[PDB]
Symmetry: C5
Subunit: 311 residues, 5 copies
């Protein structure tokens, strides 16, 4: 058991293919997903070749220990894949067809800038380290790349599973390394965010705006402050589903902006109350009247400016 | 070892059975369940046939490594079954009788549209990959498919555990696979949702309707804003027990509709105050007297419309 | 290695014993507990008998692989017993003495009807599948059943640890099975529930009843609505410590009933206000006075009936 | 492999030593802690003795399997010590010196009566079961019992790490067991409980006492009920850090006593209003004037009583 | 297997290298992180010398079991380094080049004094115990120490990953120990804390300050008491993300000091009302007008003092 020697000075080509059986547990905070797939490996080992006419047998089956198998590891896995060899088949010309079913927790970063209207490119990097004798290079067997029809990822729409055919051949620790980029394209199912977070968040805001058709300070203070407490509950709820990002997200931007609206609604209610008491209810009346228009208008404009800057 | 060779060109039939010992951890969010069971496998191996006279035994026992055992895998498992071999019995005619105990975390999707009055079909998919030498096909021994009477799933009623006798034969990575479907039929114990969520949620909503028999804006603002906040707490409570769906759930639809009632109630409470300050209490009294009948009637009709759409 | 042959037509008796070293992590929601114990097994293997006079030795020690050891399993375990053999000692007459230390996560159902004044009988089921050669039956050596004095289950009182001596012998999948039931009797330490849940829930209820000595609607609405919010927090807290049950638990019934009290207090506070505005304070004052007695009287009588129906 | 035979009838002495490398994860609810340490064992096995002159080596190194090593176990571990043998050295006189690196999750009860001003004695119980051939006894080599200087336990001060030199020899299932007690003495770092829980809790209590300088029932009902609701939040927060105990903790006692204050303050607030409504504001004023002193005085006294009964 | 012999009285030098592939799960409460890296080891074993002309090959490849490998361990790991040998390469002079891929949960203490504007120096300690035969000493091959350009730590910026080349050679349990210190430098991405915690906390504080432009006690009590409860919820939120420290953190100091502001504001609100009721509103007016400046000014200066004391 050693690497097959080169006929010419060319490197050994290991043809690879990942076929997803199950995809599950997409954790946003962890920036990880779990997977259950087939890993297909194919290379030519002439030392294994045989005569089809003399032998009579079309294909030969070997055990992993018996023959040389390349060390294909995963770059971005949390804990090293639970592998189980399914098949090793040699053709008369010495072409080896390897197949293992594995499962791995893959650490792939996410871009939350457009959350919950985001799309992500999940990655699964395959790698091979070349030895002192000869270089090993990875290739994509597009016939052996894919995903089973039923494959679902709770909370997401699965768009594609395609590998980048050209490997990344680079030298790390004075040895050649061949890296392949498999890509799982997914788009988030935003539907639930509308009845459970967005619409409730807007209702409570519109309720704070009924203070603009009220002269009762005590009621207004109750309106604006109670609803601001329910806004904090939602901000908190939202941030528990997401990691701490060094940029603003879309929901994050709306949520923050709404705080300023509360602060101003509070100011307005204070000003209105101060003018009444100072016996200026007509000046106060003019400010509430403008506020009935300004507050929903400036809200609608600011939300457009945001949607534009994010999409 | 190699698979038993065919007499003619027939496929190799492996009779299967699953016997549930324990069922536990139905996790709605992750759409999984844990299982503890027996797995029975049976197949003819002529190379193992023996004469009972010159052996003095009706059956022979073997170690898994001693004979050929079919590579039977599970399709929908989070982590590959923890398996232990119990018994291996070879009859005189060469009929092998395998038995193992396994435990696995199974990934099977759920339909939350009628939550929490829903039923589910839990699947356990058994599979076998065919060989170049010969094609392997799965079968169901109906006398070896069951569950003991003690088997319980916390918060669920276990209805049935049956298998779809006809395997789905198809090609995968240029080899024939034979897939079997074991179906565990469960229905949710909705009981607890009534005194813990449904009724508490209705009581706080009815409590907001007492504002229709009150002339006090300050009081009304307290009644409608404080109950709206307890409703937000139930919305959050409910959505913790469930995953994000691209569809509306039954509970979720009731929960959403109830926010509209709070919004309209705030409007009526607002309108009534405005009219009373404008020295139009007679108009306001008409709106409030109407609301007293309108709010319970519209609620009662809307719930009939929803129960009908969902069931 | 093969099972010992019978002298008469009799089955092989494997004498069992479980000695608890540690008990921990009783999870009410999961309906599981963890244990660390000794599993003692004893049977006669004539093939191992020897002469004490000539051998000089009393006992002969073996490694597990050297001799035949019966296949004893646990029916109700989530994560399979992590075993390590401590001793195998053979007496001159061939009586084998097996002793292993194991740890398992046992799945035993719990009856929450009387929570938090509940008592449970946790079970550990030992099992053995009989061979085609001969039948194996389990038995209890009471001399090797018990527990360490330092055994504690946080939040519980350990009452007893006995075994049901008569095994349950039944036919499962055309083979005989022998089942033993070890019973760990515990009673819940209700103490904490009094100063943390029960009494705080009563204080807030009584605070709602101070509205019966008040003529301020605005104040009463705050009293009953605020305390109802704190009541919900306790309902939520309580139900997070428990699994969803298809029956009413004791605390569950009390917590539910208290909602009816708040609902009726809101009705009274509403009615009293309505009359005051309708310029009928005399009738209002009559209802408020009757409510001062009616509410704590009906609460006391409702609780007596509940305590009676539960205990 | 059997134990060394007794020269005279004396039992075999195994000298033990635990040296802490890392201490982490003290879990109050689970009453566990995790440790990373060296375990050293030393015993005389004459069957291994050698002459330094003839052999030309003063030390002899063996594999665990090659010689006899005592089966030393831990009594109170959840999941059994993950051990890797570092070295086994035999001196010319046959004095075996064994060293291993282990890591275990140790179960050891905690006394919460003085929380968060408490001190704990964590135990690590080493044990040995004797043979039918001969008796085994444990000893402590005080030269090999310690901890690294950088050893820390998050939120705790490490006081000591010593062993109770005299074992606790006893009968278990008619065999001698020698048990040793290693003790890790720790005291909880209470510092952060002060700004995070104690002082916040006192501030909201003192804020409820401002109701005593207010004639406004409506404002008073707000002060006392809102602060009562924040007290429930701290009661809840605190009890999520602790297991349920059948005794009262220090913080628990203060937390409970503080509820009784809230109830009495509600009564005073209620009574004051009643008298004012009855045109008795003079009687009501004297009750409120008494309350202003009585509440802080009865509070400071009851805390003196409590600190005395707890420390 | 035993250590290679020395040519002279020199110790055996083992060259080390750690190459980070993945860094993840920085858990503040636990004071841990998870890493996935390459561990390179290099030492001379002349007993392994060979002739390339005789053997055929220029480099020999071995199985770990076939040769002596130094017992290099990690000091501060919670989860056992899940290791897998990638390559073992022996050159003609006997120079061994060992490559293993590992993953571990490193426990390294964090200083939260400047949280969330803090920086950390995470450590991975390599170690080796010396034999009686000969001493082993660790060394750093700077050419094999590093991290892949993609390495990211969610919520942190990775500054550097270098080693402290001079090992800590010391005595432990009468044997030589050689320790290496690999240091991973990180600075916390404070961005998210501003829109999610810091500014929402300031908005609610300023909302309470509107009570200085109000003569309404019932409203003011609502303003200061409601925002105080929202502050409590932030304090609870902040401390769920942090361990209990025996010192004050920066956020912790601000959070605490802000409660003193809420307490003083309540005092002023109480004073203002008392005077207004005592028929001295002019005095109240002077206290309220001063408060309008004093509260923001004392808040400004207090934060300047704090920021100066912490940074
Ligand atoms: C609070 C203020 C209201 C927030 C409105 C959310 C607007 C959603 C952003 C948007 O227009 O498009 C983003 C998204 C995504 O943008 P995209 O164009 O990148 O989508 C590409 C999708 N694939 C890859 C599958 C082809 O567009 C939508 O799908 C529209 C979302 C539905 C409309 C939102 C409903 C909000 C109802 C409340 C008002
Ligand atoms: C609010 C205080 C505004 C004081 C303005 C003033 O003195 O007006 C007197 C004069 C007289 O009033 C007016 O005619 C103008 C009143 C405008 C007030 C409404 C401002 C709303 C802006 C939306 C903010 C959205 C959040 C970001
Ligand atoms: C409020 C109920 C309406 C008052 C009834 C009425 O018209 O009374 C007029 C007459 C005059 O009032 C009375 O004397 C009757 C007062 C009834 C008070 C109701 C208290 C019920 C307590 C049980 C609650 C527990 C629920 C289970
Ligand atoms: C439980 C512990 C309850 C303690 C109640 C303390 C009452 C203190 C009375 C103070 C006093 O003397 O005030 C005189 C004065 C009396 O005024 P007066 O003497 O001018 O005129 C009396 C007029 N009539 C006859 C109509 C009443 O003040 C009051 O009016 C007292 C108001 C306090 C109201 C307290 C209500 C507490 C509600 C909780 C009930 C709990 C029931 C528990 C049942 C459990 C069943 C399982
Ligand atoms: C029973 C409640 C009686 C109400 C008081 C009353 O009638 O006062 C009349 C008399 C006249 O009023 C007074 O002068 C005394 C005022 C009572 C102040 C009570 C303070 C108790 C503080 C301890 C609370 C914590 C409990 C532990
Ligand atoms: C409002 C009250 C909270 C104030 C928090 C801001 C204070 C943090 C500033 C700081 O020390 O930053 C150092 C950290 C980096 O740590 P550093 O330690 O490099 O800072 C240099 C300190 N000396 C001179 C001692 C070496 O951040 C920066 O680089 C400055 C940007 C801080 C941005 C703060 C924005 C606050 C906006 C909310 C209002
Ligand atoms: C006045 C202000 C009051 C503030 C109110 C804020 C309410 C906050 C409610 C948080 C609910 C907790 O739930 C938050 O969301 C998702 C579930 O949806 C969690 O996700 C969790 O799901 C499951 C089930 O709960 C857990 O077993 C698992 O450990 C975790 O992955 C986040 O880890 C948690 O942080
Ligand atoms: C306006 C309304 C406001 C409503 C606010 C309600 C607040 C509710 C606070 C919930 C308290 C936190 O929730 C607490 O979480 C811990 C996990 O850390 C759970 O922990 C539990 O786990 C297992 C299940 O895995 C249980 O069998 C076990 O008894 C317990 O240890 C507690 O059962 C839950 O009570
Ligand atoms: C992972 C675990 C997650 C745990 C989640 C914890 C949830 C905590 C929810 C806290 C909800 C607090 O909700 C709080 O209730 C009070 C009850 O008086 C309500 O307060 C209401 O009454 C008071 C009078 O008593 C008024 O001052 C206030 O204006 C009014 O809104 C508020 O609407 C809200 O500030
Ligand atoms: C073809 C075949 C069968 C059925 C079998 O058991 N073995 C193996 O183990 C391999 C993977 C192959 C091929 N064969
Ligand atoms: C003496 C000895 C050794 C060799 C061993 O492993 N154990 C056991 O398992 C027993 C029963 C005895 C004694 N010891
Ligand atoms: Br891998
Ligand atoms: Br499987
Ligand atoms: Br088992
Ligand atoms: Br152990
Ligand atoms: Br290690
Ligand atoms: Na190989
Ligand atoms: Na086989
Ligand atoms: Na055996
Ligand atoms: Na080795």
């Amino acid at each position: 058991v050693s690497p097959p020697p080169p006929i010419a000075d060319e490197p050994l080509t290991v043809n690879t293919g990942i076929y997803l059986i199950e995809s599950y547990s997409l954790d946003d905070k962890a920036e990880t997903f779990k997977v259950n797939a087939f890993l297909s490996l194919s290379w030519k080992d002439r030392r294994l070749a045989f005569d089809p006419v003399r032998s009579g047998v079309r294909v030969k089956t070997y055990e992993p220990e018996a023959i040389w198998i390349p060390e294909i590891r995963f770059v971005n896995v949390e804990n090293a894949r639970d592998a189980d060899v399914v098949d090793i088949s040699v053709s008369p010309d010495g072409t080896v067809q390897y197949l293992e079913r594995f499962s791995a927790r893959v650490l792939s970063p996410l871009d939350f800038r457009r959350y919950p209207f985001d799309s992500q490119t999940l990655h699964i990097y395959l790698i091979v380290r070349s030895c002192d004798t000869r270089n090993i290079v990875l290739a994509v067997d597009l016939e052996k790349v894919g995903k089973n029809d039923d494959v679902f990822l709770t909370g997401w729409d699965i768009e594609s599973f395609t590998a980048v055919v050209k490997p990344a051949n680079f030298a790390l620790e004075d040895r050649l390394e061949s890296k392949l980029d498999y890509q799982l394209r997914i788009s988030r199912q935003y539907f639930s965010y509308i009845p459970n977070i967005i619409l409730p968040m807007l209702f409570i805001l519109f309720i704070s705006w009924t203070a603009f058709w009220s002269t009762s300070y005590e009621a207004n203070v109750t309106l604006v402050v109670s609803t601001l407490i329910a806004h904090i509950a939602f901000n908190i709820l939202v941030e528990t589903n997401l990691p701490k990002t060094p940029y603003m997200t879309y929901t994050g931007a709306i949520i923050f902006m709404i705080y300023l609206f509360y602060f101003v609604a509070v100011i307005e209610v204070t000003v209105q109350h101060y003018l009444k008491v100072e016996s200026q209810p007509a000046r106060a009346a003019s400010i509430t009247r403008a506020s009935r228009i300004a507050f929903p208008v400036v809200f609608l404009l600011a939300n457009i400016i945001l949607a534009f800057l994010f999409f």
